[model samples]
Target: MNVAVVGGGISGLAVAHHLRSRGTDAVLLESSARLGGAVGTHALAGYLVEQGPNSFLDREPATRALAAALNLEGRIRAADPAAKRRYVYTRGRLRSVPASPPAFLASDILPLGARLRVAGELFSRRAPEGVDESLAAFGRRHLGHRATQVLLDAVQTGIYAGDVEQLSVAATFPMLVKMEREHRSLILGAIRAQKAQRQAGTAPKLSGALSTFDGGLQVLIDALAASLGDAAHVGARVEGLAREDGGWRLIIEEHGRRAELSVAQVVLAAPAHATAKLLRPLDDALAALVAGIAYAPIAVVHLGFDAGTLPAPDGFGFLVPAEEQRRMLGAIHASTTFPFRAEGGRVLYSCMVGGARQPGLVEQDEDALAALAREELKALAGVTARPSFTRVFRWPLGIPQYNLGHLERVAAIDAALQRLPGLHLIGNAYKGVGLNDCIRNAAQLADALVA
Candidate 1:
C-alpha cells in the first residue's frame, strides 16, 4: 500500500522511515525548502545555534532506537551530569533547584511557612472524580499557592509556555493526576512509583539527562531525511486531501504548479491549524476541533560572548517563574550545558521570551528582541559585555497548550477519525509535544498501518 505523509518535520521523517522499513511504499512531502521544520541548526561565527529544541530526554527508548537504526548511536552525545543542576529565579536572584527531597527541605528558595505548606501536602485530598481541573487550581489544591507559583509555574513555562490557569492538569500532567487518584498523596505516590521502578529493574523515568548528537540536533534531521533518500520531497506542499477510489488523493502544489497523487492512506504530521485547513472540506466538525487547539508564541534569542567577559555560568540554566514577572521566561547556558556549542574561548546562551505571559514580545523586531535578551541577561546574570553574536528566532504558534477539557477534545477528535478511515493524525498537537513523543507516535502509526 502506498502511504503519503504530509509535513516534512521530524514527525514526517519518522513516519516515512518506519513505513518504508515495514516494506510499505511511503512518500514524505514538505512545503518548505528544508525537511527539519523547526529543528534547524546554524553555525554563525563559530557558534552552533539550535533554532528549535536543543536536546531530547534520553529516557524515551523510541528516539534511541531510531538513532540506532540510522547508525547514529555512536554519534550520540550525553549531556554533562552537571547539567542536572538547574536554577530557578526567585527572590530577585537565581537559586539552585533542589535535586532531592532532602535538599528541597533545606533549600532557601522557599520560606519556612511555604516549606511547611509543602510538607502539609502529605495530607492533601484527592481531586473529585470525573472532573477536569486547571493546572493552577490543581497545584494550589495540593502544593499550596507559593509552591505552585514557583515550582509548577516554572515547569509549565519550560515545557508548554502556557498559562497554568488555562492548562489542564489531567491533560498535561496525567501522571501526577493518576498518582493522586491511586495513591492520594503526591509525595507518597512518587516514593511508591520509584520503588516500583526499582523493583522492576528499570531506571526511573527522570533518571536520564538531555542528549543530542555531536553535530547538534539537526544531525538527526539530516540523517532521517538522508535515510529516506528520494522518498522525501521538499517544497512539495500538500494543498488538500480527499476521498478517491476508496483510498485518498492529495492535491499537492510544487513550484507554483498543482498536481495530484493517490495513496491508500494519509498521515498528517503537520501542525494542528495546518491540518485543520486541509480537513475542513472533509469534516467541518473535525476541522473546527483541530483549529481550536491553541498554541503559545515563543521567541528564542541566541547570544555569544567571550568566555571571560561574563561571570562563569553554572548548571544548565535558569527558569523564571511567573511570579518573577521577568521579560523572558528562562535562559539556557548552551556552552556550559553541552560545552561544545562554542569554540575559541566563547560562551553561548539561548534565552526564551514571550510565551502566553507576553505574547506580543515574540512579534518584536530582531533588534528589539536581541536588546531585550541582553538587558535581561544584564539584570538576571549581571553581565556587562555585549554579545559578539546575536540571533533571533520566533514561532508565532509555538508549543500547543493542553488547556482544560483537552482529553474530551482529543476524544472527540478520535471519534471523528472513524468517519475517515485510513486517515491518521500524528504530531505535537495530539498525544505529546516532545521529540521522543513524536518519534514514538510515528512508530505507533506505522505499526498500525502495517497491521
Candidate 2:
C-alpha cells in the first residue's frame, strides 16, 4: 500500500516513518525546504537558540522509544535538576513556585491566607459529577485570587498561551479534574496516588523535570529526515486532495513541477487551520471545526551576550505573572540551562511574547517587539547589557488553544472524519501538544492507515 503524509512537520515525518517500519511504502510532502516545520534551531556566536518548543516532558514514552531505536539515546540529556523549578513575576519581583506542598504553604509566593487556602485543597470537596468548569474558575475556587493571578496564570501562559477564563479545566488540566473526581481533594489524591505508585513500584524517579537532545531538537528532526531518505520530499507542497475510487489523490508541487498521484491512505498532521484547508472538499464540517480551532501567536526573541554581561545567578528561566503588565510572557536562560548551547562563557536568552494574553505583542513591529522584550527581560531577569546580536522568529499560529469547548469540538471533528475513508488527522490539536504525543499519534495513525 502507498500512503501520502501531508505537512512535512514532525507529525508528518513521524507518520511516514511508522508506516515504513510496518513494511508499508509512504511518501512525505513538506511545503518548505525544511523538514522540521516550526521546530527550527539556529547557532549564533557559539550559542544555540530554539525557535519553538525547547524542551520535552520526560514522560513521553514514544519519543524515548524512538530515540533508542534511532541510536540517538546518547544524545538525550536532562536539564540541570536545580534549574527545573519555574518562577512567576509578581509585584516587581520574581517568585519561584514551590516544588512541594509544605514549601508551597511556607513560601512568600502567595499570600499567607492564599497559601493556606491552597493547602486547604487537601479537604476540599470533589467537583460535582457531570460538572465541568474553566481553568480560571477552578483556580479561583481552590487556590484563591493571588494564586490564580501569579502562579496559575504564568503556568497557563507557559504551556498554551491560553486565557484561563476560556481554557477548559477538564481538557487542558485533566489531571486536576481527575484528582478531584478520584479523591475529592487534589492534595489528598496526589498523596494517595503517590503512595499507591510507590507500593506498586511504579513511582517516578522525579517530578517536573524536562529533557532535550544534547545537540538540540534540530538534531533529532534531522535524524528523522535522514532515516526517511528519498521517501521524504523536502520541497514538495501538497496543493490539493481529491477522492479517488480506491483511496485518495494528491496534487503535489515540487521544484516548479506538478504531478498527480494516488495513495491508499493519507494523514494530515499540520496546524488545525492548515489541516482544515487540505480536507475542506472531502468534509466541509470537519474543515470548519478545524478552522474554528484557535491558535495564539508567539515570537521567540533570542539575545546573545557575553557571560560576564549576563545578569547574576541565571538559572532555568522566569515567567511573568499577568499582573506584571509585561509585554513578554517569559524568558528562558538557555545558556545557563544547558551547558552545551554556549562556548567561551556566553549567555543566550530566549524570550517569548504575544501569547493569547498578549496577542498584540506578537503582532508588533520587529523593532518594537525587540525593544519590549529587552525592557521586560531587564526588569524580570536583571539582564543589563545590550545583546551584541539578536534574532526573532514569529509563529503566527503558535500553539492551539484548547478552550472551554475544545473537547467537544475535538470529538465532533473525530466523528465527522468517520464519514471519510482512508484519511486520518493527528497532531497537538487533538491530544496533548508535546513532541511525544505527536509521535505517538503519528505512529497510531500509521497503523490504522496501513491496516
Candidate 3:
C-alpha cells in the first residue's frame, strides 16, 4: 500500500519513517523550505542557539527505544547535573528552588508560615473520591493557595508556558493523580515514594533524566534527517489532501514545482490549525474541530553577553512568577546550564516573551520584540553590558493549551480520525508538548503502519 505523509516536521517525518520501517513506503510532504517544524538551529558569531526546545526529559522508555533503534545513543547528551537547581523569582530576589523536602522546609524563599502550610499537606485529605482536576485546584487543595501560586506555578512556567489555573492537572501531571489514587494524600505519597527509592538506593543525582546534545536538541532531528535520506525530502510542501477511489490524493508544491499524489493512507502531523486548513474539503466537522484548537504565540530571544556580565545566580535560570508583572515570561541561562554553548567568554541568555497570556508580543517585529526582551531581562538580571549578539524566533501559534476539556476534545478528535483506515495524527498538540513526546508518537505510528 502506498502511504502519503503530510508535513515534514518532526511529526510528519516521524510518521513517514514509521511507515517505511513497516515496509509501507510512505511519501513525506513538507510545506516549508525545511523540516523539523519549530525545531531549528542557528549559529551566530560562533554561538549555537536552539530555536526550539533546548532539552527533553529522557525518562520515557519510548524515547530511549527510538534513540537506540536510530543509533543516536552515542549522540545523546544529558544536561549538567549542577544545572539541576531551578530558580524561581519571588519578591524581587532569585530564590533557589529546593532539591529535597528538607531543603524546601528550610528554604528562605518560602515564608516560614508558608512553609508550614506546605508541611501541612501531609495531613490534607485526598481529592474528592473522583475527578481529574486542574493544576491550580490540585495544588491549592493540597499545598495551599500561596505555595501553589508562588512555588508550583513557577515550575509549571518552565515547562508549559501555560497558566496553571486552566492547565489540566491530569494531562500535564498524571503522577499526582496516580499518587492520589494510590495514597490518599499527595504529600504522603511523595514521601513514601521517596522512601522506597531510598531503600532501593536507586535515586541518583544528575540521574541523566534530561537529555539534549552538545550543540542543541536539534541534534536528534539532524540524525533522523541523515538516516531518512531521500525519504526525508526537504523543500516539499503539501497543500491539499483528498480521498479518491478509497485512496488519498495530495497536491504537493515545492520550489515552484507542483504535482499530485495518490496513496492508500495519510497522516496529519502539522499544527492543528494548519491541519484544519489542509483537511477542510474532506470533513467540515473535523476541519472546524481542528481549527478550534487554540495556540499560544511565543518568541525566544537569546542575548549573549560577557560572562558574569549579569548577576545571575549559580543555577540554570529563573522563571518569572505572574506576580512579577514583567514583560518577559522567563529566562534560561543557556551558558550556565551547558558550558559547551558558550566558549570565548560569552554568556548566553535565553528568554521567552509571549505565550497564551502575552500573545501580542509574538506579532511584534524582531527588533521591537528583542528590545523589549532585553529591557526586561536586564532590569531583572542586572546586566549592564549590551549583548555581543542577539537572536529572536517566533512560533505564531507557539504551544497548544491543554485547556479545560482539552482531554475530551483530544479523545474525540483522535477517535474520529481512527474511522479513516490507515489515517493517523501525531505531534505535541495531541498527546504532549515535548521533543521526547513527538518522538514517541512517531514510533507508535510506525507500528500501526507496519502492522
Candidate 4:
C-alpha cells in the first residue's frame, strides 16, 4: 500500500519507520524543518537542555527494539536509583513520597488520619459499573480527600498538567479503574498481582526509570530521521485530505508550491487540533470530535547555575500541588536526574509553568516567564542565584487533557474511522500522552496495516 504519514512528531516518525521496515512504500510529511516535534535538545553554556520531554520511561519493548535497531542501546543512560526519590510540596515544605508500601505507611506527607484512610482502601468496595469518575472523585473515594489533593493532585499535574477534577480516571488511568472493577480494592488488587508475579518466579515490576540517550532525546529523533532517508520530508506540509479512488488524496504545500498525491492509506499522527482541520472537509462529525479535545498550555524554563551557588539539588526535584498556589507546576533537577546534563561544577533545572492551572501565564513574554520561574525556584528551593544560562520553551497547547466524556469522544472517533477505511488517527490525544504510548500505538497501527 502507498501509505502517507502526516506530522513529523515521534508518532508519525514511528509509523513511517515501521512501515518502511516491513518493506512498505511510506512517505512522511512534516510542516517544520525539525523532525522530532516536541522532542529537541539544545546546548547552552555547556549545559544540555531539553525543549520538551527530558526523558522517557524505558519500559516498552517497542521503544527498546527501536533503540537497538538504531544502534542507540549503547548510548542509553538510566537515571540514578536515587532519582526515584520524589517530593510533593505540601504544608509549606517538600515532603518525600515513599517508594515502598512500608515507607508509605510511615510517611509524614499525609496526616495520620489520611494514612489510615488509604489503608482502609483494602476493604473499599468496587465502584458501581458503567460510571465514569474523575481522578479527583476516584482518589477521594479510595484514598481520602487530603490524599487526593496532595498525592493524586501532584501525580496528575506531573502527567497531564491538568485539573484532576476534570480528567477522567477511566480514560487516563484505566488500569486503576480496571483494578477496582476486577479486584474490588486497589490495594488488594496490587497485593494479589504482586503475589501472582512472585508465584510465577518473576520479579515485581519496579516503576520505570527515567531514561534518555547520551546526547539527549534528540538522538532518537535524529536516528529515526536518518533511517527514513529520503522518505521523510521535513518541510512538507499536508494541506488537506480527501477520499479518492478507493484510496486517499493529500494536498501538500512545500516551499510556496502546492502538489497532490494519492495513497492507499493515510495516518494522521498530528496534534488533535491540527488533525481536526484536515478531517473537517472529509467528515464534519469526526472533526467536531477531534476538535473537542482540549489542550493545556505549558512553559518549560531551563536554567543553569554553578553547583556551589546552592546546596546540591537532590532527588527528582519537587512537584507543587495546585493547592500550593505556586506559579510553576514543578521543576526537574535535570543535572541531578541524569549525568552529563551540565558540566564543570554546574547544575541544570527545568521548570514547567502554566497549564489548566495558569493558562494565562504561558501567554506572557518569554522574559516574564523566565522571571516567574526564578521566583518560583527562590520560593520553593531557596535558590537565589541568577542563572548563568537560561532558555524558555512554550507550547500553546501543550498536553491533551483526557477530561470528562473522553471515552465517548474516542468511541465516536473510532466509529467515524470505520466509515473511512484505510484512514487512521493515532496520537497522544487519544489512548495516552506518554512517549511509550505513542510508540506502542504506532507499532500497533503498522501491524494492523500490514496484516
Candidate 5:
C-alpha cells in the first residue's frame, strides 16, 4: 500500500475510505476484531443501544458528504424537536435549561440575582491577551461566577465530562473566545454570526441538528468497512512503526502471524496512549506530547423500562452538575431523542457514569454500574421499576481532555513533526473531540494526502 492508516476508529476509517474514494492506495489496520472503535451500535433485548457516539450534529458537510457517498443520506434521520430542551439537575430538581428571555427571567434554575449577572455579560471585559485561561475562568469573566459554576459546569459536563477549572478555554470552546475577540459580547456576537450565516447561505438549517442513521451510527461504519473490503484489516496490529531509508516500516502482528510492511506514508488515527507507544522509539518529542494528553473514563449504561413504568420524559435528558453530588454525569432519553430507539411499549434512557469527575466509577463491576444508573434514575426522576433491558459499556479511557496547556502542547507536537516527513497524527486527542471533529479531520487529511 502507498499509505497505511492505523487504528479502526471513525478517524482512521474515514481517512482510508476517502483516500480509496479519491483513488489513493491506502489500507487500515485495527488491533481489535471490531472496526468502529467505540462508535458501534448494539441490540439489547428489544431496544437499539448506541454505545459510543449515539449521534452527531449534521451541520458539518464532511459527515453529510461521506454519508451521501456511501448511499446513506436517505437513511439519516433527525431527532425530535423536544431534544432541544435539555435539562440540568440542580437545586434538588431537574430543571429544563431556559431557552428564551421570558423563560430565563421566569426560570428557577438561575436565581434572580444570577440572572441579572448573566445579563451583565454583554458589558463584560475581555481577558488579557496571551494568557491561557481555563474554561471556568473565562465563564466567570464573561458569564459570571454563578453561571460559571452552575451553567458552564453543567454544559461542559455534557460534552467533556471534565473539570472546567482545568480545561483550556481556547482549546475546548474556541468559539466563545472568538466571540469575545470579534464582537466583544457573546450575545451580540451570536446575533451577528447568525445574521452572517443567513446572508451567506441560500437555504435554511440548524447551525446543526443532532442526527443518526436509521439503523444507528453503525450504518456508516459498516458501509465504510464493506467498501474498503480487503483494504481494511481487523485483528491486525501494527506493533511497531519505524522510519526506514525511503519510507515508513510497520511490524504487524495478526492471528499469531507476523509480517513487515513498507509504505510511503503513515497516518496514525489511534488514541493518544496507543499512538505514543508506537512513536516512543522513533520520536520522543512526538511521544511525550501525545502521551501527555489525558483521558477521562466513563461507563455508558442503558436502561429500558416498560412504558408508563417511568415518567415519559419529553425533553432530551438531564445533566447532573458536580454540585448535584451524583455519580451519573448525565443521560440521554434515547427513546425521546429519537423515535426508534425502543420498540413500542418500552422507554430507554442512556446514562453516562463516571468521567474526569469520577474516574473510578468506570472500574466498578457491571452490576455496580447498573445499580448506579438505576439509583440515579430513581433519585432524580422517581423511577422505581427495574429496567427490562439493562446494558453497561465501559470505556477505561473515554473522552480526551483539552487541558490548560493543550494548545501549547499541540503546537510543540506540530513543531517536532516539521523535521519528519511522511509521518502524520490525527485523532480526537489533538483537535476536537466530537464525531464531527473526527470526520472533519480525516476528510481534510485525506484531501491533503491525495493532493
Candidate 6:
C-alpha cells in the first residue's frame, strides 16, 4: 500500500477521502465498529440531534473542496439567519454577544465600566515577545478580567469546552496572538482586516458562518465512507507499528484475526491518547509528548420540546461561564439553528455537560445526566416542562486542550518524527481540533503521501 491511515474519525476518513483523489492506495483502519469519531448525528422521535460536533465553520478552502469532491456541494446548509445571535448566561440572564461595535456599545451584557475597559484594548500593552499565555490571561489583558471571565470565557466554552485560564492563547486562538503582534490592538486589527477585504473586493466569501450537511454533519462522513468502500475498514485495529524495509509495517487485529500491512508511509490519525499508545513501542519520548496533550470529556444531552414548551430566548442557545457554577456548560439551539432538525415545530436543545469545568458530571448514568441538563435548563434558561424526547452521548476524550507549552510540545513531537521516516500524523491533537482543521491537515499531506 502507498499509505496506511489509522483511525476512522474525521481526521483519518478525511485523509482517506483525499488520498483516493491523488491516486494513493491507502487503507483506513478503525478500531471501533462505528466511524466519524466526534462528528456524528442521532435521530429520535422526529428530532435530529448531533451526538458530537453539530457544525463546522466553512472557512478553510480545503474543507469545501473536500466536500465538493465528495459531491456534497449542494448538500451544505448554512446556519439560519434567525439563529445568528449567540448569548452568554451572565448575572442570571441571557445576554447577546455583541456582533458589531454599535452592538457592543449598546449591549448591556457588560457593565459600563467593563465595556469602557474593553475599548481600551486599542492601547492595551502587548505581551513580551516569545511568551505563551493562557487565553484567560490574554483576554484579561485586552478585555479586562470582568469581560474575560464572562464574555471571553463564555465564547471559549462553546468551541473548546475548556477552561480559558488553562488554554494557551497562542496554541488555542493563535489568530488573536497574530492580531496583537501585528496591529497591537485586536479591535483595530479586526477593523483593518475588514478594510483590507473591502479594498481587495473579496470579503471572505467562505468564512465566519457555521454550516452542516443537509441531513446533518454525519452526512459528510457518510459520503466519505461510501467513497472509500472496502479501502476503509471498521472494527480493524492497528496493534503494532514498526519500521521495515525503508517503509513501515502495521499489525492489525480484526475479529480475532491478525493481519500485517506494509506501506510506504503511515498517518496516525487517532486521538492524542490513542496515538500515544501506538507510538510508545517505537519512541517513548514521542509517545510521552503525544500523551501529554490533554483532552476534555463532554456529555451531550439532547432535549426535545414541543414548540414554546420552554421559555428559552430567541436565537442560538446560551453558554454559562464557569462563574455560573452550572452543571451543564452550554447548549445549541439545534433545531432553531437548522430548521430541518425538528419536525412539527418541535424544538431541540443540544445541551452539553461535563467539560473541563465538570468532568465528573459526564460519568453519571444517562438518566442522571438528562436530569442534570433539565435542571440546568430550568435554573438558567427558564426551560420548564418534561422533554418529549431525551438522548445523551458521552465522550471521555472529546476535545483536546492546547495548554501552555503546547506549541513546544507539538514541535518536539514533529522534531522526533523526523528521526523515523515514513511515520507521520494528522489529527485534532497536533494542530487545530475542528473538522476544517483536520481536513486541511489531511489535504496538506495527500500530495506527499502519493509521491
Among all windows of ten consecutive residues in candidate 1, which has the lowest summed lDDT?
A: 200-209
Preferred candidate (TM-score higher): 2 or 4: 4
Count of clashing residue pairs in every prediction: 0, 0, 2, 0, 0, 0
**On residues 1-451, what C-alpha lDDT tens digit does candidate 6 reach at each position?**
5888999998899888788887778889999898888787777799878878888887889888898788898999888757588888898788888788878987899889899999888889878677788999898889998899898888789889998989999998878888888998988998899899798536446756788888998898888889999999999999899988879889999989999888988999998888999899999999999999988999999888877777434787789999988788988888878888778888888899987867888788999999888898888888879888888899988789888899999999999999998899989998988888888888888766765
List candidate 5 segments past 4 Å from native.
81-83, 194-207
Pairs in steric clash, model 2 = none
Q: Arrange candidates, best lDDT first.
A: 4, 1, 5, 6, 2, 3
lDDT of 4 at 12: 94
- Over all chains combined, what TM-score does candidate 4 have? 0.97
Model 2 segments more than 4 A misplaced:
128-131, 201-208
- Superposed Cα deviation of residue 124, candidate 1 (Å): 1.3
Query: What is the C-alpha local distance difference test score of each model?
Result: 0.88, 0.80, 0.77, 0.89, 0.88, 0.86
Off by over 4 Å in 3: 128-132, 194-208, 307-313
Worst 10 residues of 5 by lDDT: 200-209
Model 3 lDDT vs. the true structure? 0.77
Better of 2 and 5 by lDDT: 5
Provide the global lDDT of candidate 5 against the true structure. Answer: 0.88
Which residue pairs in model 1 clash with each other? none
lDDT of 1: 0.88
The worst-scoring run of ten residues by lDDT in candidate 2 lies at 200-209
**lDDT per residue, candidate 5, 155-175, as tens digits?**
899889998889998999887
State the displacement of the C-alpha of residue 420, model 6, in Å, after optimal TM-score superposition: 0.3
Error of 2 at 153 (Å): 1.1
Q: How close is candidate 3 to the true structure, as a TM-score?
A: 0.93
